[PDB]
């Protein structure tokens, strides 16, 4: 009967679907590798999917995945045990060498453009018409570290024009240079901005940008990455 047939068919269908769905989630990260970077033996039941090419906007080229993968940067780590499956210890200063929760990716060193060709993220002083419609205005306030000692003061709000949303907060240190702190990493308060992630003496450590009016994809990652890894590495300089 039909019913029994409809249901036997579905499960055969659902199996191809799961087959279909999993190979698709293998376009990035695969093939797998041994801790030393060489092709692993057991690669799993599912095979790599036939390559697909994307056509990046604003004529920035193409993207084929699956494709030859590479970190395109040096990793400062070392084995801690002679058997596969243990943690790898940072040979230098994790925050600076870019590892652990402070690691970044070698994205494109080009800024993001909106649908119309313009840079997607601009400072607010360069963003005509934009202003703080609601909530406390951060600009003008001192930025405090996870050690309760001040590190600087907010000078501007880098916003996402297409989604009209603040992504970063420009900050001025003692030497008078600025830095980008991701919005999703600070608690704006009635009289100050708090950054539990970093400690006073770590803002200078933050990666700086090349152009004072643009952040590239590569630089976004180094910034966000650096700021995040201090939840672990800046821990010995914090109090609750």
């Amino acid at each position: 009967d039909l019913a029994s047939l409809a249901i036997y068919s579905f499960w055969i269908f659902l199996a191809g679907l799961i087959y279909y769905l999993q190979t698709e989630n293998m376009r990035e990260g695969y093939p797998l590798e041994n801790e030393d970077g060489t092709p692993a033996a057991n690669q799993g039941p599912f095979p790599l999917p036939k390559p697909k090419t994307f056509i990046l906007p604003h004529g920035r080229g193409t993207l084929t995945v699956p494709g030859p993968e590479s970190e395109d940067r040096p990793i400062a780590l070392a084995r801690t045990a002679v058997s596969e499956g243990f943690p790898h210890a940072p040979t230098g200063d994790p925050m600076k060498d870019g590892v652990g929760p402070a690691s970044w990716v070698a994205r494109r060193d080009l800024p993001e453009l909106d649908g119309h060709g313009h840079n997607k993220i601009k400072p607010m002083k360069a963003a005509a018409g934009f202003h703080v419609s609601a909530g406390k205005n951060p600009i003008g306030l001192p930025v405090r570290g996870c050690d309760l000692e001040i590190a600087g003061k907010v000078v501007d709000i880098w916003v996402d024009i297409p989604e009209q949303m603040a992504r970063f907060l420009e900050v001025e240190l003692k030497d008078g240079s600025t830095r980008l702190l991701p919005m999703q990493m600070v608690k704006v308060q009635s009289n100050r901005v708090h950054v539990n992630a970093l400690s006073s003496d770590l803002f200078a450590g933050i990666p700086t940008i090349k152009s004072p009016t643009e952040v590239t994809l590569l630089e976004e990652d180094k910034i966000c990455g650096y700021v995040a890894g201090g939840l672990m590495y800046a821990a010995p300089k914090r109090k609750s």
């Binding site: 579905f10 989630n25 376009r27 970044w104 609601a134 406390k136 990493m185």
Partner: protein, 302 residues
């Protein structure tokens, strides 16, 4: 404590975004609506503009005559007494024609005709809007995913009041128009066919219903956790994998053995939810037409 990014803490406003053009007839897009500071904490605060156009207004109208037609019948039952209307608002109901009339349209307005009217006006309103979702994507040069997925939701709805009542032989097997009333139909329907619980599809259907709450709570929470790296900027992470995309995958790889890609997860997402109405549609179609009782079917499988 730690920032959770649930609600924005600083709002920012700029020149109303009139949006991309492409092959769209900018002559139809209305003007920009106001800005909602309220809605501005969860997400964007810009209301409007909305693309009207021919087929679009058709839907808007057909969709209002549906509501208004059910409304006047609700009022006939209320005896045009304002007080009764708000009281028995959930009790009223525009039931389908008696099983005697079958699949005909020669039924009286006080015994089923007014239902048929309402259903025709809604048959128009939904399909024309479906087309709207397809055309509105053609104009921007995008994929028709939203179109096909909306089709599955229709598949269930169609089976419920069109395809099934016709395969059975009368408009009486259709769903009525009312709050409480369509709540009894649902219960009755199971009872008449031997407790839907024994239905393989209805049960496969709940698998995805729950599955959607699991996938979306999972996806959303994962994306919020990595937004500190620009996670919510997915399309972006798709053309250029950032630390937000790798850490997001690694969390799930170390938790349950396997992970997904920034795009792949949206293929799980889309299919996980669509498979809800797709299965519950085959389940309700085969119920009462090929299978009379699911407990019985359950003992055999034949």
């Amino acid at each position: 404590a730690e920032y959770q990014n649930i609600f924005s803490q600083v709002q920012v406003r700029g020149p109303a975004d009139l949006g991309m053009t492409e092959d769209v007839n900018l002559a139809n897009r209305s003007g920009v609506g106001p800005f909602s500071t309220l809605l501005g904490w969860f997400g964007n605060a810009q209301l409007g503009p909305i693309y009207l156009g021919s087929l679009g207004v058709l839907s808007l109208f057909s969709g209002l005559m549906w509501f208004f037609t059910i409304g006047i019948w609700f009022w006939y039952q209320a005896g045009w007494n304002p007080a009764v209307f708000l009281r028995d608002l959930f009790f009223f109901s525009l039931e389908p024609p008696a099983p005697e009339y079958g699949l005909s349209f020669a039924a009286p307005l006080k015994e089923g005709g007014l239902w048929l009217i309402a259903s025709f006006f809604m048959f128009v309103a939904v399909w024309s809007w479906w087309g709207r979702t397809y055309l509105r994507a053609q104009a921007l040069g995008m994929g028709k995913h939203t179109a096909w997925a909306f089709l599955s939701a229709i598949w269930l709805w169609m089976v419920l009041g069109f395809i099934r009542p016709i395969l059975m032989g009368s408009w009486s097997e259709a769903v009525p128009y009312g709050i409480f009333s369509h709540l009894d139909w649902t219960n009755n329907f199971s009872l008449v066919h031997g407790n839907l619980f024994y239905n393989p599809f209805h049960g496969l259907s709940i698998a995805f219903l729950y599955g959607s709450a699991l996938l979306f709570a999972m996806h959303g929470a994962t994306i919020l956790a990595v937004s500190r790296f620009g996670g919510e900027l997915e399309l972006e992470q798709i053309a250029d994998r950032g630390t937000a995309a790798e850490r997001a995958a690694l969390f799930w790889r170390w938790t349950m053995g396997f992970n997904a890609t920034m795009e792949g997860i949206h293929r799980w997402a889309i299919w996980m939810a669509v498979l809800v109405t797709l299965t519950g549609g085959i389940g309700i179609l085969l119920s009462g037409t090929v299978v009379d009782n699911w407990y019985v079917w359950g003992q055999n499988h034949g």
